[PDB]
RNA sequence: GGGAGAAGGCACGCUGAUAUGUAGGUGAGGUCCCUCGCGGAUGGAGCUGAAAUCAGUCGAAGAUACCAGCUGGCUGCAACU
RNA sequence: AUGUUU
RNA sequence: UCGGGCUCAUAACCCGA
RNA sequence: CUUACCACUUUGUGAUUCAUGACUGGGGUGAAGUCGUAACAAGGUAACCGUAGGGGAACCUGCGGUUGGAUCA
RNA sequence: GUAAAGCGCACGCAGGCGGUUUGUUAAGUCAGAUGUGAAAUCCCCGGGCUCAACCUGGGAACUGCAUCUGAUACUGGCAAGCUUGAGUCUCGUAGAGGGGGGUAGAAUUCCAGGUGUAGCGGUGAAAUGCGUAGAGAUCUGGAGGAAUACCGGUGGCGAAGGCGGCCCCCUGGACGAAGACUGACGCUCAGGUGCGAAAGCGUGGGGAGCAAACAGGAUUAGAUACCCUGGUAGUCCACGCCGUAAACGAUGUCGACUUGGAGGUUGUGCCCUUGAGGCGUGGCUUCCGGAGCUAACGCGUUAAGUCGACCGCCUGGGGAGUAC
RNA sequence: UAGCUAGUAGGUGGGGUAACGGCUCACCUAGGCGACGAUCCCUAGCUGGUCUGAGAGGAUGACCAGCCACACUGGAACUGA
């Protein structure tokens, strides 16, 4: 938004699915995709397209199961002026491991799993679930 | 406001490049002008607690945008103010 | 603005040194300059001369004489000269 | 107007 | 002041003496 | 012996804090005291806010504002 | 929002926060290593007292601090930019936006003159008050002050307070159209600065109407009121001051999103324009309401929905927004 | 409590300590500290740790152990590692 970008992103999706929306959109950004991969490649979205070599556009194709949405439990965390950082023995574990928390480790951003799997900490992001 | 015939003049004098309304050089000059003019007007009435606000809004921007220079290309800042004697 | 010299205190002589008399003040030669002299600049001889700090010293006492606010607190009245 | 009473 | 009325009841109000 | 520093201690003048003080502002309790009835219904002049003046008391009145106002205005 | 709680409103320093891409740095951060964080409590396992209390071995632990070397995703710094944020230019658009200066017509009051005569005015009735010194009414002339009917509206403009006849001058903001230019220059903001309804205060002016105070008349058991007759401050102006309000959407500002329906108002593109109109797209604005939110009432794309940046504030009632 | 501070902040050279240093002295500059809260007022020995608590957090610092300070009150130096 007119301050913190990513914040809006996580919202856009949670909002859309809230009203069985097709697929919300937002101006794509390198960090936006790094968090996008951990969605399509982590089972949470169909896929994301692009548009604009100079004026990009992210496209998170939401999903829904039986009679409810898929990604129905997302929230930001390491927001500005409150950024959170934790060590390996502090790493998160979204909803008792049942969920996932995007973590921007020194070795690229990746799901909570790859965090311990790779053995290292990173800028915790959201609590996808 | 400044006569339409005015702005188009100052710009061709301060505008970083031939005919351009956007750079600080042009921004400032275009502002300082209306500020210097209104000064006399305000020397009259002086009760217009409304028109004066605009005087501030734009003046508050003068010192404001003038900073952009420092925070950015300082080489021109001094070269720009030395033109209208501003800051002093 | 005042009240306020509120109140209440400290130091005050003299000798020597800093400095053979100091800072400051005054300013003669000599040099320079130009209408060119009741000129200027520069020069600092001489003259004069506070004040401070040290150290030392005499008496009972150094603003020693003459001279020269007593001070504060509560209240009436009337602004005030 | 009041009622533990204009 | 008193006696009667008015009110659920007081005062007030009305009547009478 | 002398000087320097300095303790006990002396003096003046303020700051601060505690206790106390004739009388007194407002406040709080308490005995079915006396005077009203201001407010809650359109509370019987709709109420309240600022503010100003006045009156035994609630309060009254003026100016602006609010609805946190009744009726078929 | 209404339970305690959004400064009355703006501007803005510090402070906090920061669209996007690349390069660089490696400070925040992550990884591993090392010193070090006394022992003893504590805890895990295990021993010694007959058990237990207690005693005791080892280890874990001691978030910590620093240092060494690495990692570079995000954050921060530097360099280079980019454009959607924000800003300038052009042309227009509406409006009670503001300050100043003139001017207009209706009406009240007063004064004057004619006509005309025993009432007017007021109230629930009355009375005070005004009338034969001729009112009231009716007509003619003049003075003055304040306010701008109809328009006018859920209408408009403004940060808020607030701002209406007409005209001129000076002047602030908003909005739409094409592009052109700037190139994150932005958001918020303790303190600080400025604006502030009404009443009130100081100086000098002004004074028709209304009216605190006050004086009569009336009502009443009383009536320092409500009602009537009068009426001073004030209400008006210029300058200066006070800064309060149920300064109210009782809802801080900015930005991003999430069904829709009818109306208002104001730009602009377009359709036999071929109509009033038919279809778009913006700025602001009412009523309704959907998911959701909510203790409920209700709010509902102008949120009280879902998110983020910054700030202000709340923490039982009375005492008291009082005392010092 | 919103201002605070002259050996005060720094610089020269003397002096001094076991040793750095206004530690002290002379002179010189006029600094230094403060809302990231100085100065001032009240209170208190600090820690490991202790209690409580799911944890974060809150409360606490007796006996055990480390550190500091004190020894009738105020002051001072002597001996000596
Ligand atoms: Mg007497
Ligand atoms: Mg006299
Ligand atoms: Mg009674
Ligand atoms: Mg009684
Ligand atoms: Mg007392
Ligand atoms: Mg009543
Ligand atoms: Mg009433
Ligand atoms: Mg409340
Ligand atoms: Mg507000
Ligand atoms: Mg330990
Ligand atoms: Mg970077
Ligand atoms: Mg508006
Ligand atoms: Mg006024
Ligand atoms: Mg006045
Ligand atoms: Mg609704
Ligand atoms: Mg030295
Ligand atoms: Mg103690
Ligand atoms: Mg708990
Ligand atoms: Mg002793």
UniProtKB/Swiss-Prot annotation, chain A:
Molecular functions (GO terms): rRNA binding; structural constituent of ribosome
Coiled-coil stretches: none
PROSITE patterns, per the entry: RIBOSOMAL_S8 (PS00053)
Record Pfam families: Ribosomal_S8
UniProt keyword terms in alphabetical order: Repressor, Ribonucleoprotein, Ribosomal protein, RNA-binding, rRNA-binding, Translation regulation
Alphabetized HAMAP family for the sequence: Ribosomal_uS8_B (MF_01302_B)
Subunit structure: Part of the 30S ribosomal subunit. Contacts proteins S5 and S12.
Family to which this protein belongs: Belongs to the universal ribosomal protein uS8 family.
Function summary: One of the primary rRNA binding proteins, it binds directly to 16S rRNA central domain where it helps coordinate assembly of the platform of the 30S subunit.
Protein known as: Small ribosomal subunit protein uS8
Organism of this sequence: Escherichia coli (strain K12)
Swiss-Prot record, chain B:
PROSITE patterns named among the record's database cross-references: RIBOSOMAL_S15
GO molecular function (one): rRNA binding
Keywords carried by this UniProt record: Ribonucleoprotein, Ribosomal protein, RNA-binding, rRNA-binding
CDD domains per UniProt: Ribosomal_S15p_S13e
InterPro entries: Ribosomal_uS15, Ribosomal_uS15_bac-type, uS15_NS1_RNA-bd_sf
Pfam families found in the cross-reference section: Ribosomal_S15
Gene3D superfamilies the UniProt entry points to: 6.10.250.3130, S15/NS1, RNA-binding
Keyword RNA-binding: yes
Gene Ontology CC annotation, any one: cytosolic small ribosomal subunit
Annotated GO biological process: translation
HAMAP family on file: Ribosomal_uS15_B
Family to which this protein belongs: Belongs to the universal ribosomal protein uS15 family.
Oligomer status and interactors: Part of the 30S ribosomal subunit. Forms a bridge to the 50S subunit in the 70S ribosome, contacting the 23S rRNA.
Task performed by this protein: One of the primary rRNA binding proteins, it binds directly to 16S rRNA where it helps nucleate assembly of the platform of the 30S subunit by binding and bridging several RNA helices of the 16S rRNA. Forms an intersubunit bridge (bridge B4) with the 23S rRNA of the 50S subunit in the ribosome.
Name of the featured protein: Small ribosomal subunit protein uS15
Annotated organism of origin: Escherichia coli O157:H7
């Amino acid at each position: 938004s007119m301050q913190d970008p990513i914040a809006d992103m996580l919202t856009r999706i949670r909002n859309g699915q809230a009203a069985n929306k097709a697929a919300v959109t937002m101006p794509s950004s390198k960090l936006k995709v790094a968090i996008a991969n951990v969605l399509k490649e982590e089972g949470f979205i169909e896929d994301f397209k692009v548009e604009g070599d100079t004026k990009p556009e992210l496209e998170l194709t939401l999903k829904y199961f039986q009679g409810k949405a898929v990604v129905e439990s997302i929230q930001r965390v390491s927001r500005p002026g409150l950024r959170i950082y934790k060590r390996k023995d502090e790493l998160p574990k979204v909803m008792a491991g049942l969920g996932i928390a995007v973590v921007s480790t020194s070795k690229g951003v990746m799901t909570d799993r790859a965090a311990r799997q790779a053995g290292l900490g990173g800028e915790i992001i959201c609590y996808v679930a | 406001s400044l006569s339409t015939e005015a702005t188009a003049k100052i710009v061709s004098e301060f505008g970083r490049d031939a005919n351009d309304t956007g750079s600080t050089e042009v921004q400032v000059a275009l502002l300082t002008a209306q500020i210097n003019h209104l000064q006399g007007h305000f020397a009259e009435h002086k009760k217009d607690h409304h028109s004066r606000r605009g005087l501030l809004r734009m003046v508050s921007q003068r010192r404001k945008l003038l900073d952009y220079l420092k925070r950015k290309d300082v080489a021109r800042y001094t070269r720009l103010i030395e033109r209208l004697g501003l800051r002093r």
